[PDB]
Amino acid sequence: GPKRGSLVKILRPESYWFNQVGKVVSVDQSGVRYPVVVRFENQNYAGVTTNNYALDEVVAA
């Protein structure tokens, strides 16, 4: 999908960072179900700033 370091927009609706912008770490090229690693400059309620997403949950915006 998107390359490393590019900005995406999250469309997983139950994500903390839904409808917001993060930054791509890597995209795994195996048959993994959620390969897109996105970092966020703000933390969720668990104090986590990184989450895996799918290809149809990120939009390069």
Binding site: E14, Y16, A46, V48, T50
Partner: peptide, 8 residues
């Protein structure tokens, strides 16, 4: 659930 890192 407290230990799980994924969101959600």
């Amino acid at each position: 659930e407290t230990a799980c890192p994924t969101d959600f």
